Amino acid sequence: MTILFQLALAALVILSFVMVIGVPVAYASPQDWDRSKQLIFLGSGLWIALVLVVGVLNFFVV
Amino acid sequence: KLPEAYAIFDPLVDVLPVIPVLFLALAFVWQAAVGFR
Amino acid sequence: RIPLWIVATVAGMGVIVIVGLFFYGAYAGLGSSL
């Protein structure tokens, strides 16, 4: 659970780092954001879940 | 202090506050790249 | 050919670092009070 918590929490960080850089260059260059509309959606969706994971999983570590 | 678990992220939180300033700076990076239109 | 905006932003940060190093030294070096 503890490591499982540190996994989710840390991964939430790297994903955000990827998301924070991703979304900009996505909307910017109109070479797509229709194939990246798939990528962004999965990143966004996953992000929320991760936050909810770390959320419930928090009352179990601290 | 930060809850025992998050303590690993203690160094990370030490820098977070300054981030907003960077946005103000970034805007200048952009304008420099686009040759100040 | 190295794009000017990159030259400045790199030299810009390079300045913030060394000057920021100076401000740290205000709390550690001989310029401290401890």
Partner: peptide, 28 residues
């Protein structure tokens, strides 16, 4: 001990999200 590793990445991140745009050329 040395969270300067953090700043570094998040610091070069800013110019990166526009540098990649100077590469993919568009919308600046």
């Amino acid at each position: 001990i040395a969270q300067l590793t953090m700043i570094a990445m998040i610091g070069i991140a800013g110019p990166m999200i526009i540098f990649l745009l100077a590469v993919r050329r568009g919308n600046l």
